[PDB]
Amino acid sequence: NSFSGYLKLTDNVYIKNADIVEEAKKVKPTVVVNAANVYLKHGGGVAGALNKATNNAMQVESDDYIATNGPLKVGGSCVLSGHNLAKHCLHVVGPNVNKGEDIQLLKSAYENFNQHEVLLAPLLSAGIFGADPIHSLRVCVDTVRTNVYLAVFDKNLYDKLVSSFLE
Ligand SMILES: CC(C)[C@H](Nc1ncnc(N)c1Cl)c1ccc2c(c1)S(=O)(=O)CCC2
Known part of the structure; x- marks a missing residue:
């Protein structure tokens, strides 16, 4: 958990302009x-980048999990191997709001982070999932109680999130 170069927003939420894959390799x-x-x-997107960095081992393990357990629910989670x-x-x-899923489920999604003391994470439902990224950051800050290090791979978005939160 050797996180470096993050900006501390609250007592438990940190943010950095970085590729989550590059962070996972360094940290x-x-x-x-x-x-x-x-x-x-x-x-x-994020899932494709993480899977590619495991040389597809994450996708094979994921297919095996789905075969035995069925799909997840929107707002839900599962713990599988971190691989390398x-x-x-x-x-x-x-929620993927571009596909009509309820934005209120973003609180349920972030609640899953509270079962783990320290996490490296992306900004949930941002990008092609269509949620307002400033709203996603606010739900993260209001919902996560454990220590979360957010990696956002876009300097322009990073700067807008920091500005909107320090207002
Ligand atoms: C807002 C983006 C800059 C950010 N991208 C990234 N953030 C950090 N590490 C990366 N490798 C990338 Cl690709 C982002 C965060 C959340 C999501 C996506 C994208 S998505 O479009 O893949 C759909 C699922 C939710």
Whole structure:
């Protein structure tokens, strides 16, 4: 958990302009969070980047989990191996508002982070999931009580999030 160069926003929420994959390699965190979908198909974006960094081992393990347990619910999670990136990967499904899922489930999604003391995570439901990223940060700050290190891979978005939170 050797996180470096983060800006502390609250007593338990930190943020950095960084690729979550690059952070996982440098930090070797106990838990890395994946911004998953309910069938754990890691086809692009954050999930695709994390899966590619495990040389597809995450996707094979995920298919085996789904075969035995069925899909997740929106707002839910599962703990699987972290492979070479972390001890564990916490796969969390935030709502995809571009597909009509309820934005209120973003609170349920962040609540899954409270079962782990320290996490490296992405900004849930941002990007192509369509949630307002400033709203996602506010729900993270209001809901997560354990120590969360957010990696946002876009300097422009990083700067807007820090400005909107320090207002
Ligand atoms: C807002 C983006 C800059 C951010 N991207 C990243 N943030 C950190 N490490 C990365 N490798 C990337 Cl790709 C982001 C955060 C959340 C989500 C996505 C994108 S998505 O479009 O893959 C859909 C699922 C939710």
